[PDB]
Ligand binder design. Structure first.
Ligand SMILES: [K+]
Ligand SMILES: [K+]
Ligand SMILES: [K+]
Ligand SMILES: [K+]
Ligand SMILES: [Mg+2]
Ligand SMILES: [Mg+2]
Ligand SMILES: [Zn+2]
Ligand SMILES: [Zn+2]
Ligand SMILES: [Zn+2]
Ligand SMILES: [Zn+2]
Lengths: 594, 594
């Protein structure tokens, strides 16, 4: 059983000389101390230590010139030639902090070499550069160096970057390179978060030969945690890594996504870093190299770094805080999957696109409503109810205005269940189903010889359009009808239109009941100055079906009449409410007519 | 760093006495020898061995009575009481093979105990019972025993069964138990494969409290391999395991799914077993217990068992043979995901169902075609072309029969791109798109003032209906028309109808060209006795667009005229062929009219 490698050269006394090294020198000190306290390493290196001590190194000028030059060798371009002045000033500049730059760069190469040569199973370099956190960086220099020196063993390198910041430099260094896969999880927020570039967006997958060898997972907000990252690793990172089949894994291992870090504002516990490390160790014959990066909380760095070290040694990881991925996270991973399905066999289903502006392309919203309008005309002579504004959105039965009883149904679009091959988003039209419970009420209303009006609510402010359309239909058609007994059945966001109608018009005379199948819509009530009369009427002339998981249960203290008569439903979806409460509701409205 | 456990008690001399022990005694011998040859264990157990030797044990009568009885204790039922006669005959029956039953059962409990108590990190029991492979079995007895003896540490047990046979007994023993999660990958084939029961189907998820705590992955055929199993582990097994959060992992570790096993006929290499083991070791604080089970090839058992042992010791696993999952496998995992999304947060999207027999439920096939028929009537007065048989399937322009030029388009249903929340199979009707390139030709044909006929092919023998419908339309409408210049445009399986038409009717007179956008449909040609005249005509009056990945390229030797003039297309899908070749094809057909 091979030992793991550990490179550490703090130089605390030398670091006490520096003034005006933004890098905190006690960062590496705290990491080493935590590993030592656990008993994995000693101040005096012993053959009993499970960590093999690897001596730190200074990167030489000739060494670094080879990296920048040999890759150019592997058509010719003068602007692509190695520049001695620039390469030198990065290694030997005026300030004495230059020593740390040389030591950090060289030690990364030396430590990773110990892994590639098989001297150790894996390694952890705890040697930091002087400059700020977030011309090749250490990870890039190391990656390129291994590909060059050991071409018979290393032909593909995987770079996993789980620092909360996107590595612009690392990505750009291999953006055209197909043999180096760069994977990055980072806080993005539409490119607002540091470095504030759009370069780390999900759409950037590489270019030229390196197309499909850059994978970005840009989180859209703060507060991501254990479940979110393990979710991303199980659904994206590990499947892609297995397909890439790397010969070497290098981790840009920052800890500013850890709980306690005030900059990153994420909630990763040490166990998350232990699990991620352990997963990666299944790759590349175990050849994993950890490079210490960012982090702003010494305690978070200490505990998280210990967890990473423990996984390298084969110590079992702890229990995750949670395996629950929040909606923002899964939406991000869905977006990533759609993009990445173009380049990776394991990312499915493949997402095909089309332009609604094209003449031969139509949104299903219009397709479904047109179908309904056609079916209803053939069966009942139901026709379009015109809405003057500055088609088939509103439908009505013939001679609806001459019936004693009138039903007005206000609903969002129907349920359509998409089924087919799970290889793409193309649907099987035989197995895909239109589920239209509203039609049960339409059918029923016609059988009773009631007048009927059917309003289809539009989808993506939006409530403004819903409220106005309900008022329009009321003022222009329902109000001017003969019906003595008017009924309303609402679905979802239709509730906003109906309660606003009851608050804006004198409906108490002719409206006998207002049913509302909320579904996943949060409960809302009347908004009126009428303290007594109106809220009492609404409560006595309504049925508001609520699920056990409605948002009104998170602060369920107020029992107001203006919320209407609340009714319990077993079903969370509006569609299921309408279908299942169909019998009970229809019979209830008939009995109201006596 | 804790050692791993190894229990081994071959008793070769005792086993030489048995005659007429179906279990092959050299099974355990080959496993131990392979581990020893690698240098992980010695004949004379040493403190230097990375495997700690755990002494074998006989299961006692009182011990086993506690298991069967204590679970009954944890309402009352006489038929649920422990029976002393049965429990005894299983441990002490007449034949001397009884000793092996006691030794195997006791050693499993002892070995697993060493893991739970933390004496070892993990363990591998290499002690086998006498009976055939595939009243609690060893895995079940062990699982229940740990839950009973160490209730403060073990409250949830995960059982992973990757023997190719379903463990009917294990499943049935915990089917109502929510604290024991049973996961099984097995060759099923509609319950034809041994044990030949439907008990291992994907739909059986448990019952009572144990509902949602049984997960079956039933492979539908032979030949599953590395990519298929790692696919199943990444998409199903590990996500569910992480959500269950077991305190102990027990592996029913059979090797009859290994390459070389003539019974299982699967292709798992040793690396697949190494990777699966390594993944599971991330769970339950590393508390993993391997129980040796089935396998019919001693060499396959030897190499695969070595791989499992190596993972327990923390040795990096080898490279997989492939990460490619075959269509049968992904279809199985899709099926599993749909079922399991009812009980597990991590299995998404949730699958909702509906009954097309219901009056308010319609298949999208009919919805889309009805929409097309409506849109075309409003725009061009295109109407239904009746098909007498013992609606809107066939559409035609008004006075199509009085035009000099006539276009007949034969097509499968249009492309519909399903988009929305990836939490369910419910579609967002705003983002979901109907993509109908056939309408480009319809529009174009009307602009040219050509006659038009549009035939929609049905979906799921099936080719019989396609061929007959084409002949019907020809004999009844196209044949009897005035058009001197007839054109055919086919899509997908429509090719079968068009080539059959050219072979069954005298089309040489009036038909000027027959276009076919194959897409993913394999190339087919004429089937006629006419050796010269007909195949020559078809070649000179056709355009057959073929993708680079058509099935005709796997044996592409014959260049026949009866296949038609083959044309190259960049696009694999019929829909993309029609849209992209639209300009070139329309202009080509116009030039034919001179
Ligand atoms: K990153
Ligand atoms: K790259
Ligand atoms: K099994
Ligand atoms: K169970
Ligand atoms: Mg359009
Ligand atoms: Mg139906
Ligand atoms: Zn320094
Ligand atoms: Zn950072
Ligand atoms: Zn035996
Ligand atoms: Zn078996």
């Amino acid at each position: 059983l091979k030992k793991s490698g550990l490179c550490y050269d703090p130089r605390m006394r030398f670091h006490a000389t520096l003034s005006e090294h933004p890098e905190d020198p006690r960062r590496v000190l705290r990491v080493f101390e935590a590993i030592k306290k656990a008993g994995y390493v000693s101040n005096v290196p012993s053959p009993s230590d499970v960590f093999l001590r690897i001596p730190a190194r200074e990167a030489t000028l000739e060494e670094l010139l080879q990296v920048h030059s040999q890759e150019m060798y592997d058509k010719m371009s003068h602007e692509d030639l190695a520049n001695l002045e620039k390469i030198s000033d990065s290694l030997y500049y005026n300030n004495e902090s230059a020593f740390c730059a040389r030591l950090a760069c060289g030690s990364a190469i030396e430590t990773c070499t110990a892994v590639v040569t098989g001297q150790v199973k894996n390694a952890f370099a705890v040697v930091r550069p002087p400059g700020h956190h977030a011309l090749f960086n250490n990870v890039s220099v190391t990656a390129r160096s291994m590909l060059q020196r050991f071409p018979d063993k290393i032909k593909r390198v995987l770079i996993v970057d789980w620092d909360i910041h996107h590595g612009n430099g690392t990505q750009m260094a291999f953006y055209d390179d197909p043999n180096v896969l760069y994977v990055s999880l980072h806080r993005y927020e539409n490119g607002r978060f540091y470095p504030g570039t759009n370069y780390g967006c999900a759409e950037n997958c590489g270019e030229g030969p390196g197309l499909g060898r850059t994978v970005n997972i840009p989180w859209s907000c703060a507060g991501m945690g254990d479940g979110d990252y393990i979710y991303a690793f199980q659904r994206v990172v590990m499947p892609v890594a297995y397909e890439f089949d790397p010969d070497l894994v290098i981790v840009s291992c920052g800890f500013d996504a850890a709980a306690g870090d005030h900059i990153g504002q994420f909630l990763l516990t040490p166990a998350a870093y232990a699990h991620m490390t352990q997963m990666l160790m299944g790759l590349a014959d175990g050849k994993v190299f950890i490079s210490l990066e960012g982090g702003y909380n010494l305690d978070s760095i200490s505990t998280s770094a210990l967890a990473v070290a423990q996984s390298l040694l084969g110590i079992p990881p702890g229990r995750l805080h949670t395996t629950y991925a929040c909606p923002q996270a899964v939406a991000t991973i869905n977006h990533v999957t759609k993009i990445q399905s173009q380049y990776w066999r394991c990312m499915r289903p493949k997402h095909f696109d089309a332009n609604p502006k094209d003449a031969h392309v139509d949104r299903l919203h219009d397709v479904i409503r047109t179908y309904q309008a056609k079916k209803l005309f053939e069966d009942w002579k139901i026709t379009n109810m015109p809405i003057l504004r500055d088609n088939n959105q509103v439908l009505c039965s013939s001679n609806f205005f001459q019936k004693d009883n009138l039903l007005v149904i206000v609903h969002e679009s129907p349920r359509v269940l998409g089924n087919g091959t799970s290889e793409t988003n193309v649907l099987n039209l035989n197995d895909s189903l239109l589920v239209d419970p509203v039609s049960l009420y339409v059918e029923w209303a016609m059988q009773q010889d009631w007048g009927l009006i059917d309003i289809n609510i539009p989808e993506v402010d939006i409530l403004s359009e819903v409220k106005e359309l309900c008022l329009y239909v009321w003022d222009n058609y329902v109000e001017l009808s003969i019906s003595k007994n008017i009924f309303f059945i609402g679905g979802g966001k239709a509730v906003h239109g109906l309660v606003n109608l009851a608050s804006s018009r004198n409906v108490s005379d002719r409206v006998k009941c207002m049913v509302n199948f909320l579904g996943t819509e949060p409960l809302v009530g009347l908004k009126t100055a009428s303290e007594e009369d109106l809220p009492t009427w609404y409560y006595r002339h309504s049925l508001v079906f609520v699920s056990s998981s409605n948002e009104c249960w998170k602060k369920a203290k107020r029992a107001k009449r203006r919320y209407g008569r609340l009714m319990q439903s077993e079903h969370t979806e509006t569609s299921d409410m309408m279908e299942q409460h169909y019998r009970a509701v229809t019979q209830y409205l008939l009995h109201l007519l006596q």
